[PDB]
Amino acid sequence: EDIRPEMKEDIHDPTYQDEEGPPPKLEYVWRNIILMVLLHLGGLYGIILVPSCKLYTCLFGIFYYMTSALGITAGAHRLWSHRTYKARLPLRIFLIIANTMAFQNDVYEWARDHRAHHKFSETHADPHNSRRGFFFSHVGWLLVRKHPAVKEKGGKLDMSDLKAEKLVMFQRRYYKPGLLLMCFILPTLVPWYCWGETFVNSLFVSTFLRYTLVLNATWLVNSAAHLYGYRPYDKNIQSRENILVSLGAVGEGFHNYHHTFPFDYSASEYRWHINFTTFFIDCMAALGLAYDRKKVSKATVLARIKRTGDGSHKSSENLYFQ
Numbered sequence: 001e002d003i004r005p006e007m008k009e010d011i012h013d014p015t016y017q018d019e020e021g022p023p024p025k026l027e028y029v030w031r032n033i034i035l036m037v038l039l040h041l042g043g044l045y046g047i048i049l050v051p052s053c054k055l056y057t058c059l060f061g062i063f064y065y066m067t068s069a070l071g072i073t074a075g076a077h078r079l080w081s082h083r084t085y086k087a088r089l090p091l092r093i094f095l096i097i098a099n100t101m102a103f104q105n106d107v108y109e110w111a112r113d114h115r116a117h118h119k120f121s122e123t124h125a126d127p128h129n130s131r132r133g134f135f136f137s138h139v140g141w142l143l144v145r146k147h148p149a150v151k152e153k154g155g156k157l158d159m160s161d162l163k164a165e166k167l168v169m170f171q172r173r174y175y176k177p178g179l180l181l182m183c184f185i186l187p188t189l190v191p192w193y194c195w196g197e198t199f200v201n202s203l204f205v206s207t208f209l210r211y212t213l214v215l216n217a218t219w220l221v222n223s224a225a226h227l228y229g230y231r232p233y234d235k236n237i238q239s240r241e242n243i244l245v246s247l248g249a250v251g252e253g254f255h256n257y258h259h260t261f262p263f264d265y266s267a268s269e270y271r272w273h274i275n276f277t278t279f280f281i282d283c284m285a286a287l288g289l290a291y292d293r294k295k296v297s298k299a300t301v302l303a304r305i306k307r308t309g310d311g312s313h314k315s316s317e318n319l320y321f322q
């Protein structure tokens with residue numbers, strides 16, 4: 001059925017394929033390459049600095065990880081890219097601040113790539129085309145120029161819903177000072193001042209390592225979740241169910257389900273099963289900050305499993321009622 005007719009720019013289009021001849025060579029962006037290397041070097045140095053950190057520093061890092069995660073999953077992903085539920089201003093203010101902490105480009109840019117990632121999955125119009133391998137879909141696409149198909153096909157996507165949202169456009173306008181404050185400055189000064197953590201530890205652990213972990217956990221949804229796992233809902237696509245990815249990406253590891261039903265607010269068959277994001281949204285709904293949560297019916301899901309499933313769903317039947 002059509003449970004979300006307000007938006008259809010994330011529906012997979014099997015019609016579009018790569019038929020423009022041999023693909024052009026990759027064009028390296030050395031500025032991004034250098035910065036990405038230095039970031040992971042600093043993050044690695046943070047790991048060996050963890051045992052010398054205070055308890056609050058480690059706890060603050062986890063808190064900042066989880067909050068930033070919600071900014072991507074509950075906000076950039078399920079809310080603004082897919083429109084799977086409606087959030088009121090206080091929650092949207094939280095999510096837009098949380099998203100800014102995560103530093104994965106502004107919401108508008110994030111959703112524009114993501115809608116293209118769903119419509120033209122596994123093609124040259126897919127920003128993280130998994131056909132190019134693990135490395136490209138993981139981080140490689142952030143180091144090279146986008147394929148012309150991304151710009152052309154993606155440019156035909158409707159983004160007017162995000163253009164008309166004042167909060168989204170507000171973040172885009174002031175994204176540079178925002179990301180500097182929320183992703184680098186504040187999470188470094190807070191441990192430095194509040195519980196007397198050293199500046200070195202706060203910089204490499206509470207900022208560099210944390211941000212590095214958020215990135216790679218997110219990137220695993222593009223790489224690992226497109227290569228390893230089962231496909232209980234649709235075997236014809238490359239999206240996979242990955243439990244480990246769900247743990248790291250607070251519930252975004254059920255990727256086979258999600259690509260099959262991009263309009264589901266839980267991004268999974270079961271709501272709270274290894275899905276902290278859905279649990280968060282449901283809590284917000286209890287407070288009256290969120291509503292119009294769209295869940296695919298059991299009948300539709302069960303019928304799709306019969307039609308295009310790989311047969312691995314038999315082991316996950318009747319886990320929960322919801």
Ligand SMILES: CCCCCCCCCCCCCCCCCC(=O)SCCNC(=O)CCNC(=O)[C@H](O)C(C)(C)COP(=O)(O)OP(=O)(O)OC[C@H]1O[C@@H](n2cnc3c(N)ncnc32)[C@H](O)[C@@H]1OP(=O)(O)O
Binds near residue numbers: 104142143147150153
């Ligand atoms: C724990 C949390 C777990 C969360 C799990 C959530 C899972 C969700 C599902 C998986 C998705 C997750 C993916 C998100 C992760 C990636 C985010 C980051 O890492 S970012 C990390 C930090 N951020 C970074 O590191 C940034 C690094 N990236 C870059 O520097 C560049 O983007 C580039 C070098 C990669 C491409 O360079 P280049 O080829 O020169 O292309 P340009 O970009 O410069 O575009 C210029 C023009 O092209 C046009 N156009 C482009 N795209 C589209 C489109 N999709 N459509 C239409 N048009 C498009 C447009 O006109 C644009 O103009 P304008 O918008 O300016 O007006």
Ligand SMILES: CCCCCCCC/C=C\CCCCCCCCOC(=O)[C@H](O)CO
Binds near residue numbers: 050210248
């Ligand atoms: C207590 C001692 C800690 C020592 C290390 C501190 C490192 C500080 C730096 C970054 C924090 C990383 C936290 C990642 C949590 C991911 C599981 C998140 O998973 C979940 O919340 C659900 O399982 C997902 O559905």
Ligand SMILES: [Zn+2]
Binds near residue numbers: 222239
């Ligand atoms: Zn995907």
Ligand SMILES: [Zn+2]
Binds near residue numbers: 077081082118262
């Ligand atoms: Zn999605």
